[PDB]
């Protein structure tokens, strides 16, 4: 985009976890699709195992990430539980008109 100033499209292929309501099981319409999603792992937890498996991170780094997950999960649950308890001249002169009337004949050389 910065090199050619042209639109770029990124198609992110993922999956919808739940229907469009609390009591919506779209397995009525797409049973095969939702049978796969039933046995899927979260795109955050799966990536966590991949970094351990590839030797990118250790079990100490797995604890640094798991403590950060709870530290950010508790962060919003407690902040919300605490914040819940605390609840004109519209005309011009003729000389201006004569400037606009002359601009139509102020043609370039």
């Amino acid at each position: 985009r910065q090199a050619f100033k042209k639109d770029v499209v990124i198609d992110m292929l993922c999956y919808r976890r739940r229907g469009h309501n609390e009591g919506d099981d779209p397995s009525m319409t797409q049973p095969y699709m939702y049978d796969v999603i039933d046995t899927k792992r979260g795109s955050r937890k799966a990536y966590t195992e991949a970094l351990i498996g590839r030797g990118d991170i250790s079990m100490k780094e797995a604890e640094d990430a798991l403590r950060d997950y709870q530290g950010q999960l508790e962060r919003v649950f407690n902040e919300v539980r605490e914040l819940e308890k605390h609840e004109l001249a519209t005309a011009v002169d003729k000389a201006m008109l004569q400037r606009i009337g002359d601009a139509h004949l102020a043609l370039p050389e």
Partner: peptide, 30 residues
């Protein structure tokens, strides 16, 4: 790689052995 399967049995049979921070990660595995 290793504790993806190993600490899952150390927590399901005895949850006191596995660190209390891995309980909110090993439950969502199986």
């Amino acid at each position: 790689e290793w504790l993806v399967e190993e600490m899952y049995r150390k927590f399901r049979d005895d949850p006191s052995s596995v660190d209390p921070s891995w309980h909110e990660f090993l439950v969502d595995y199986s």
